[PDB]
Nucleic acid binder design. Structure first.
Ligand SMILES: [Mg+2]
Lengths: 576, 206, 22, 52, 105, 49, 57
DNA sequence: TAACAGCTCTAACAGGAATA
RNA sequence: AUUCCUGUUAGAGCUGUUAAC
DNA sequence: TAACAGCTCTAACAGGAATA
RNA sequence: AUUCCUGUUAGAGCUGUUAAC
């Protein structure tokens, strides 16, 4: 069974679903696994009999692990990761002292190293929002007792071997959600963890597994078999009418590495008439992340704790401009709402198709798709005939900043509109390179008075500079002053970015003048750049950057006209 | 290269030092071409056995002591290697010896701790005319932070009549060993150091 | 009676709360 | 014990399974012979690949 | 030490991988004396430029990754320390690099 | 093993971050770090956070 | 103390468990392919013998 | 999955030297 | 590659917005 | 410093090849 | 000296216990 079909199968019926989390899931919770516990025990014992400093040598080192394992093999102990080893080393270290064994197992799996990850939190959310009612997990430490309690905010009824008959009563009286530990909490003496204790099953809990088998279907994750009592309970559990109504998928992180007992167990169930399926869904965390993703109408209150990254942190406010102040190149566009034109097409259209129609027709208007057009209707009639046009109406953009941030098409459209507006009534030529718009001093009109201030900006030692011309050592390359103008969405504001550049008349032959572009820009220091930016502000706006609110409209003689207003003074902020 | 002829003549004279120096001068044609070859294969014929071993002199020992400061390995081959019966035994021996002398590492201790240095001190007898001379030298087999592992020996030094290093000499050789270990591991202390001496440690030596 | 090693194991395992009478 | 047992296996000059002594002891003995024969070696330390 | 003359043949062949392998293999004479030195100054003549940098390859990174597990720091020097007019640049960049690679901080 | 995008998956970031603070603990005799700064040239996805 | 964990550097520098000159590591228990040595135990803890006194060294 | 928009990055080259 | 990051020429990666399949 | 006892090791030779 | 360390023949160094100088 493929994983996606299993997800649909679960999503299709997750209301009635027992979970059977093994010790594998707690692997991520940060709790030491079974192998980590075994290695800690060997290291704890090896250092005491052979007097060696405990903290001097670590445990996850390869050399120390090999040395300790060689020592263990020297005394005839089991060789490597073999059965009857974990219980063997426990009973060796603690020499049949179940109180001390319990205390150590509590300390190793204590509730201070546990950091809940997405898997346990998602399962606890499923418990609270009441899709899964029974969670039997052969674990010990309360990764979920903690995690569902933290996200739901309500305490969880954990069941164990100290009572062990609570689960059957709670199941019978429908006191969901129930979280019955088949091997019990470590706070309680019954722990059921050594191999001799792992051959028997508690009568009342075993009874509960069978009664719960009929009511729900089982999903077991992070469980690799190797336990005889749980396997025989499931087999007994499998041996009943509609044992798993929705079927049982034994999920494993890897089908290839799954033990034959499971696959043997899965094949065994199928012969008894149940629809048990073995699937691979990767790790438990990824499985539960996907399951939560497919969950519909998840409450916001619990989802604010399930996925803390979903909520937006670091909303740290900025202080006031009170009390040297950098002067950036950002002109704030205080326009909040604009009007655009919409055309309805009888057939669906593609933004590429509209772009090629722009290239062919070359109208005196702007258009984009989302089809929002800015300009005159007759231009659109030239672009689109009456047959393909259903209606032409109006569009209002109440929040320009949110609109451009949401859709990049709106960003490009508004950038092109403001660029056309700024260069509508001025002699400065408008070009494009890559997707950046450039306002460049024209070659012929370089002697204008409105450029003279710019001529002062580039001048050396206060004399008259040059604005346009030919490269010193180029055959045909022509150069001019220019400004790259862009639209930047910052927070809830829109700004115009101006950057002084040296435009080259041939587009593809810019690199041949690189040295010149370098040479002309070697000494454009803070004062010179300040002067050039002021001159460009004056050219583009017509007013000096003091207390100005110049307003510019694109296509003023058109029915659909956009009227922007940009402060003539660039952004500044005095130091605190 | 060819062994210079006078060596054969000094073979009759029974002068070990002269024979070793003549062999070194024979190999002197290889001093300039150190980059071309990695391992030299000096062969000592059975006819030179008269100077192979005699009181106070060891031919292979003298040859290697003369060639080591020149930094060129030799794998001396006598008639023995071409005198046995099992060819695979000698072939394994020479192949491993040559590969390790070139600069390679045929094998390394699996999961060896890089923070432990295993010192080993031994000694040798020189039968002086008036008394005895005890030559004590140390060796280290530590594993550096890299993947390869090191194995370096050095003298413990002016005159010793007993094989027990005093306070000063032992403190000095162990400080030199500590500096040697520090140089490889960026400067980290050896957490535990193991010392294997052929004789008991004195109270001052500990 | 108990071997000193098991006494050491008990002591290290719970050393945060154990007295010392001299 | 484990350190010495492992050390008796990294003698490249030896073409058999192990030795009687750790390589530290045998190489210290070999260099002791080398130094005893030639007194003008005491200044410098040498690698094992030279005298093996 | 002296690089093998086969390095020149490989460089003429324009094979970066084999050139890096040969440069590393030239280090055995120093590896017999790894305890002797702290930092190795590997020089590359301009004639090897054809293998310095081309697509899907970089000689400097290959050399660094090949000699990193061998624990020996390496200060690669290109003809850049020869020319290099502000020639007290070299003494500080190279000197600070040498001190950092031999010891540290 | 291979990655198609420079945004680490939730398992990869958890593993890398685990290796990082384990290294810090080894260099700090087990003491937990109190401030962690993860600088990335690209934006953190939801999985990374 | 040699098996107490997570101790600050200053404390370990201060104590360092001094130094162990008279090494004495416990022999395990009798235990249970046991090897047979050639040594025969002697349990005669004391014996009686004679002394002669001489007028000259 | 196929285009299209923006934001940002690296991958190869080239390249000159600290307010003149 | 003692360094530095300034540009050029390209491609990807993410987001999106449509059309689907 | 001259014997004596034991423990232990190296110095020179010689010497065969791993359950027969 | 491809190696291994089993024997033989000797001597030295450590400890001790005496005799003293
Ligand atoms: Mg040899």
């Amino acid at each position: 069974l493929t994983d996606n079909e299993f997800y649909q199968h679960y999503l299709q019926n997750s209301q009635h679903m027992m979970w059977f989390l093994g010790a594998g899931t707690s692997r991520s919770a940060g709790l030491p696994t079974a192998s980590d516990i075994i290695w800690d025990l060997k290291h704890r014992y090896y250092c005491l009999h052979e007097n060696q400093d405990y903290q001097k040598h670590d445990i996850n080192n390869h050399a120390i692990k090999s040395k300790i394992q060689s020592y263990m093999d020297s005394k005839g102990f089991p060789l490597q990761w073999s059965p009857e080893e974990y219980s063997f080393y426990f009973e060796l270290v603690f020499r049949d002292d179940y109180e001390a064994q319990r205390k150590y197992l509590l300390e190793a799996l204590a509730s201070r190293k546990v950091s809940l990850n997405i898997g346990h939190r998602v399962l606890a959310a499923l418990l609270e929002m009441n899709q899964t009612k029974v969670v039997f997990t052969t674990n010990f430490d309360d990764v979920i007792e903690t995690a569902f309690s933290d996200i739901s905010g309500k305490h969880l009824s954990v069941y164990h071997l100290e009572g062990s008959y609570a689960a059957l009563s709670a199941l019978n009286t429908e006191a969901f959600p129930i979280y019955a530990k088949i091997h019990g909490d470590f706070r309680y003496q019954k722990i059921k963890n050594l191999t001799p204790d792992l051959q028997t099953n508690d009568r009342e809990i075993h009874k509960c597994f069978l009664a719960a088998a009929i009511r729900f279907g089982l999903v077991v994750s992070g469980y690799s078999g190797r336990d005889e009592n749980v396997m025989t309970m499931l087999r007994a559990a499998i041996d009943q009418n509609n044992a798993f109504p929705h079927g049982l998928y034994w999920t494993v992180p890897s089908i290839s590495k799954s033990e034959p007992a499971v696959q043997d167990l899965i094949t065994y169930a199928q012969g008894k008439g149940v629809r048990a399926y073995l699937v691979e869904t990767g790790t438990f965390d990824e499985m539960l992340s996907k399951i939560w993703r497919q969950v519909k109408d998840k409450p916001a209150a619990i989802d604010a704790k399930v996925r803390t990254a979903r909520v937006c942190p670091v909303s740290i406010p900025l202080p006031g401009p009170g009390k040297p102040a950098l002067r950036t190149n950002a002109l704030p566009v205080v326009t909040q709402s604009i009007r655009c034109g919409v055309v309805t097409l009888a057939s669906p259209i593609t933004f590429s198709e509209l772009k090629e129609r722009i290239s062919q027709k070359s109208p005196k208007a702007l258009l984009t798709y989302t089809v929002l057009f800015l300009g005159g209707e007759p231009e659109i009639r030239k672009i689109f005939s009456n047959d393909e046009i259903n209606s032409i109406g109006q569009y209002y953009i109440d929040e320009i900043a949110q609109s451009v941030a949401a859709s990049t098409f709106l960003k490009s459209f508004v950038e092109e509109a403001i660029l056309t507006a700024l260069l509508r009534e001025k002699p400065i030529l408008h070009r494009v390179r890559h997707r950046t718009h450039y306002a460049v001093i024209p070659n012929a009109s370089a002697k204008d008075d409105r450029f003279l201030d710019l001529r002062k900006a580039v001048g050396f030692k206060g004399d008259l500079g040059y604005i346009t011309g030919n490269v010193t050592n180029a055959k045909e390359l022509s150069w001019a002053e220019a400004v790259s103008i862009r639209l930047e969405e910052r927070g809830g504001k829109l700004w115009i970015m101006l950057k002084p550049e040296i435009w080259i008349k041939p587009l593809d032959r810019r690199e041949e003048a690189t040295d010149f572009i370098r040479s002309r820009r070697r000494y454009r220091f803070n004062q010179c750049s300040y002067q050039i930016l002021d001159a460009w502000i004056k050219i583009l706006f017509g007013s000096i950057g003091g207390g100005g609110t110049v307003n510019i409209s694109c296509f003023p003689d058109a029915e659909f006209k956009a009227e922007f207003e940009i402060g003539t003074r660039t952004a500044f902020s005095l130091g605190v | 290269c060819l062994a210079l002829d006078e060596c054969h003549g000094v073979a009759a004279n029974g002068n070990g030092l002269a024979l070793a120096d003549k062999i070194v001068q024979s190999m002197s044609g290889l001093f300039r071409q150190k980059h071309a070859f990695d391992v030299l294969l000096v062969y000592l014929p059975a006819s030179w056995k008269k100077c192979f071993e005699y009181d106070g002199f060891d031919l292979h020992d003298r040859i290697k002591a003369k060639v080591a400061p020149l930094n060129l390995p030799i794998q001396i081959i006598n008639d023995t290697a071409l005198t046995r019966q099992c060819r695979a035994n000698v072939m394994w021996g020479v192949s491993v010896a040559l590969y390790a002398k070139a600069g390679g590492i045929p094998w390394k201790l699996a999961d060896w701790d890089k923070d432990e240095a295993y010192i080993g001190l031994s000694y040798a007898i020189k039968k002086n005319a008036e008394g005895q001379e005890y030559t004590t030298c140390c060796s280290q087999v530590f594993d550096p932070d890299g993947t390869g592992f090191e194995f370096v020996a050095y003298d413990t030094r002016d005159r010793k009549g007993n094989p027990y290093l005093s306070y000063q000499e032992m403190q000095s050789v162990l400080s030199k060993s500590l500096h040697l270990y520090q140089s490889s591991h960026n400067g980290r202390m050896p957490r535990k150091i193991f010392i294997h001496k052929t004789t008991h440690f004195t109270e001052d030596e500990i | 009676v108990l071997t000193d090693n098991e006494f050491y194991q008990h002591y290290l395992q719970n050393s945060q709360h154990m007295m010392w009478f001299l | 014990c484990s350190s010495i047992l492992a050390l008796t296996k990294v003698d490249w000059n030896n073409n058999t399974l192990y030795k009687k002594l750790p390589v530290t002891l045998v190489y210290s003995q070999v260099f002791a012979d080398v130094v005893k024969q030639t007194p003008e070696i005491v200044n410098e330390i040498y690698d094992y690949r030279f005298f093996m």
